[PDB]
């Protein structure tokens, strides 16, 4: 049959630290 | 019918504040 | 077909200022 509908979305990891 | 595609990518959270 | 599997990993944005 025909191929399903897309998957859901995937969070990334923590950004860098601030500046001082 | 086969799996649909992958869906979308998943940002992560801030970063930890920055040094004095 | 079933819903695709799950997309990949999204990293934040950089952390707060420290202090000045």
């Not at 969070?11 to 860098?16: M, R």
Request: no cysteine; net charge neutral.
């Amino acid at each position: 049959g025909p191929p399903g509908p897309p998957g859901p979305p995937g969070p990334g990891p923590p950004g860098p630290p601030g500046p001082p």
